Amino acid sequence: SILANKDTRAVIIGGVAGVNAAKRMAQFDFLVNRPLTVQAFVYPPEAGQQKEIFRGGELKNVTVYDSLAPALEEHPDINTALIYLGASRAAQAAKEALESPNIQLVSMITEGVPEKDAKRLKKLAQKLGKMLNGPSSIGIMSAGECRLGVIGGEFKNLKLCNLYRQGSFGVLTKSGGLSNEAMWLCAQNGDGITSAVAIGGDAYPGTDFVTYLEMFEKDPATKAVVMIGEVGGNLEEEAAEWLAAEPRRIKLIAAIGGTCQEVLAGSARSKMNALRDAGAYVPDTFGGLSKEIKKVYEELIAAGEISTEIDEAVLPELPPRVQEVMKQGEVIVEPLIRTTISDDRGEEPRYAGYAASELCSKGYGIEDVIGLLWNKKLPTREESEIIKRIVMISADHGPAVSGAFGSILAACAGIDMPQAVSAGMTMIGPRFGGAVTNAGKYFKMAVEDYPNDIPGFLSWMKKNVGPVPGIGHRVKSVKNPDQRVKYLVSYIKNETSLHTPCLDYALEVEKVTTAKKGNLILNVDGTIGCILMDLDFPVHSLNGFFVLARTIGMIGHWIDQNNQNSRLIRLYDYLINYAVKPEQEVPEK
């Protein structure tokens, strides 16, 4: 191996691209059974957050720092920086990393880094005696030891290219996609790789071919190097100069792209000729490269430099996602919730089995959607017409009522509509609008247990529940009738075929209660409660009609106060009775 080893600990400077690199590096760390290479992330937009990175099936939380100084302070361990930032920020981040005394190697994936910036960074890395790889480098891969970047692809590829143990071949490419092809060629025709380095495709790489060839020459494990170059520059010429200059231990296998000298100094024929003359194994096409690797590998077996020691390893496999195991029925997942009313999993929601848009097209209304979601049955025209009227008649009853006033208070406190309406909806309960369910229950119980005994029902209620749910009003009375209840009752009794025993009973108790106190009228809660109980709607659903209806009013009041640009309400002093304790001195503790 040459630059990355089991002692390499990285800091990734970049965002989502950096996190994807880290996730790939974690897969390698799982395969070769080593601790996580990524120690930290440096990304000011996400500073303070933690990234969840899986090392196999184990979740690792990696911290995101604002800058490099706190990252290295918290992780002195770090000796490598990977730059995953865009062109406008990459060079400054690379400068910061090179100037950090802990960092020895800086690699850049970034494309479009100005030549002037790459030249300045190469000069700085030389002054400081540090290694700079890239820009435009997919990474560095040391088989069985370390992966820096996305180099090596999917987990199945790491296994196919035998990247879990050291081979005898080094890989040097300009091209990212071709380092992965070279790694495969070495596994397929040789014994795998030691290290693979993508130097980058930029005019001025941080480290050239000779710099890496010098390092490979000093690595005892590397017996040959597969170098993949192309037309442009003299990086391959300088490598041929390096090979010719002295007797080298490593064999050089080279393929040069750009022999398109039939279609429109740094020529691919001039590079192939320099290398061939220097003693390198140069094939005529990229296809011949597999044959050159087999040639060198067979020489190495014969010359006793490679041992035929079979791959004695039971390799770890990537854990499946819970959904995969579930599909196969190989795991039991007890659901968190059960829903029976709607399915959103298709192209559109299905309410009680019916497609939402199909209901619109076929002429159904809001009242029909209420019945589907609350009763799981499409209402009948009669039912639908009653639901419609209950909602319309209950929609609003001015601003003085708790629910509406709650919304107005929140609207004036500068609260957004959903939150302001939630405060008003909190007021719906035993005293305001939320006696629909209990009115239904107690009047049905009266019909069953006290059919011809209203004083018995009333005595039982006084002793056991208190005031009768559905009876009484603060402003409406016998002298000031509630036309809302008169309207609903006359609709049910004169415009429908519905037999209403609860409503009939409730209307009789109203005659008795209003004889006691004129305000003890059957109210909207009691009226809706009885009508719905007589329609045989589920008992739980009864308060829904008020809650839903009064939401129309509550949103109305919120919109109104906003259109008025209402200021914060602070209740007037003269309206408060401060029946407070006399003022007193606090005793010493």
Partner 1 sequence: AKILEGPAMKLFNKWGIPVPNYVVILVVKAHIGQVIIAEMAEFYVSIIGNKDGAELLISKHGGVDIEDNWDSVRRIQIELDENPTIEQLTELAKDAGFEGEIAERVGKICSRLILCFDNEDAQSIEINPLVIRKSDMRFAALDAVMNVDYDARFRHADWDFKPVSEIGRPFTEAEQQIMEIDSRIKGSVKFVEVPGGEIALLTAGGGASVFYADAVVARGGTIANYAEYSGDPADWAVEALTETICRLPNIKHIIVGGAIANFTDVKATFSGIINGFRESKSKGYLEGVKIWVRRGGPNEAQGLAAIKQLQEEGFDIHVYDRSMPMTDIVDLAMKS
| Residues of this chain that bind its own copies (CB under 8 A) | 360, 416-418, 491, 538, 540-541, 543, 555, 558-559, 562-563
Please, are residues 282 and 228 in contact by the beta-carbon 8 Å criterion? no
**Least separation in angstroms between CB 501 and partner 1:** 25
Q: Which residues bind ligand COA (CB under 6 A)?
A: 14-15, 17, 20-21, 44-45, 84-86, 89, 109-111, 150, 462, 467-468, 471-472, 513, 516-517, 520
Tokens at residue 578, please?
């401060």
- 550 among the known binding-site residues? yes
Look at residue 471 and give the partner it binds from its own copies, ligand COA, partner 1, none, a contact being a CB closer than 5 to 8 Å depending on partner kind: ligand COA
Buried b (16+ CB within 10 A) or exposed e, 533-549: bbbebebebbbbbbbbb
Q: How open is the CA angle 366-371-377, to the nearest 5 degrees?
A: 130
Q: Consult the annotation and say whether 190 binds a ligand.
A: no
Q: Which of 188, 198, 158 is nearest to 30 (CA)?
A: 158
Q: How far apart are CA 175 and CA 200, in angstroms?
A: 6
* Residue 585 labelled as part of a binding site: yes
Number of chain positions touching partner 1 (CB under 8 A): 54
518 within 8 A of 502, measured Cβ to Cβ: no
In this chain, which of 131, 143, 163, 228 binds partner 1, going by CB under 8 A?
A: 228
- In this complex, which beta carbon is closest to partner 1, that of residue 255 or of residue 404? 255
CA distance 408 to 394: 18
How far apart are the C-alpha atoms of 375 and 255, rounded to whole Å?
73
Nearer to partner 1, 176 or 403 (CB): 176
Q: Is 468 annotated as a binding residue?
A: yes
Cα–Cα distance for residue pair 46/63, rounded to 1 Å: 10
CB distance 244 to 277 below 8 Å: yes
CB of 33 to partner 1, least distance (A): 23
Phi, psi values for residue 518, rounded to 5°: -55, -25
Of ligand COA, its own copies, partner 1, none, which one sits near residue 129, judging by CB under 5 to 8 A according to partner kind?
A: none
228 binds, among ligand COA, partner 1, its own copies, none (CB under 5 to 8 A by kind): partner 1
Separation CA 139–CA 84 (nearest Å):
11
Is residue 286 a contact point for partner 1 (CB under 8 A)?
yes
**Which is nearer to partner 1, 56 or 257 (by Cβ)?**
257
419 marked as part of a ligand binding site: no
CB neighbours of residue 290 within 10 Å: 16
- Report the alpha-carbon distance of residue 223 to residue 211 in Å, rounded: 17
Give the residue from 233, 268, 275, 237 showing the smallest Cα distance to 253. 275
Residue 14, binding choice from partner 1, its own copies, ligand COA, none, Cβ under 5 to 8 Å by partner class: ligand COA
Q: Return the number of the residue (265 or 586) whose C-beta is nearest partner 1.
A: 265
**134 known ligand binder:** no
What value does the CA radius of gyration of the chain take, rounded to a whole number of Å? Answer: 40
Distance CA(39)–CA(384), nearest Å, equals: 63
CB 481 within 8 A of CB 530: no
Q: Which does 467 bind (CB under 5 to 8 A by kind): its own copies, partner 1, ligand COA, none?
A: ligand COA
Q: 485-524 burial, b for 16+ CB within 10 Å, e for fewer?
A: beebbebbeeeeeeebbbbebbbebbeebbeeeebbbbbb
- Minimum Å gap between C-beta 522 and partner 1 is 17
Segment contacting partner 1 by CB under 8 A, of 26-34, 262-270, 382-390, 474-482: 262-270
Q: Whose CB is nearest to ligand COA?
A: 86
Site for partner 1 in 145-164 (CB under 8 A): 150-154, 157, 160
Report the residue number, 255 or 530, with the smaller CB distance to partner 1. Answer: 255
516 annotated among ligand-binding-site residues: yes
User: CA angle, 153 as apex, 115 and 19 as ends, to 5°?
Assistant: 70
Strand partners, 40: 11
CB of 471: closest distance to ligand COA in angstroms? 4
What does the alpha-carbon distance between residue 365 and residue 123 come to, in Å, rounded to a whole number?
Answer: 74
Nearer to partner 1, 173 or 375 (CB): 173
Q: Which does 76 bind (CB under 5 to 8 A by kind): ligand COA, its own copies, partner 1, none?
A: none
Min CB(209)–partner 1 separation in Å: 13
Query: Tokens 């009653």 sit at which residue?
Result: 386
Binding-site positions = 43, 86, 89, 111, 397, 431, 433, 462, 468, 470-471, 473-474, 484, 516-517, 519, 523, 550, 567, 570, 584-585
- The binding site for partner 1 (CB under 8 A) comprises 20, 87-88, 111-116, 119-120, 122-123, 138, 150-154, 157, 160, 173-181, 183-184, 188, 201, 203-204, 228, 230, 255, 257-260, 262-264, 268, 284-287, 289-290, 515
Binding-site positions for Ca(2+) = 584-585
Binding-site positions for (S)-malate = 397, 473, 484, 550, 570
Binding-site positions for CoA = 43, 86, 89, 111, 462, 468, 471, 516-517
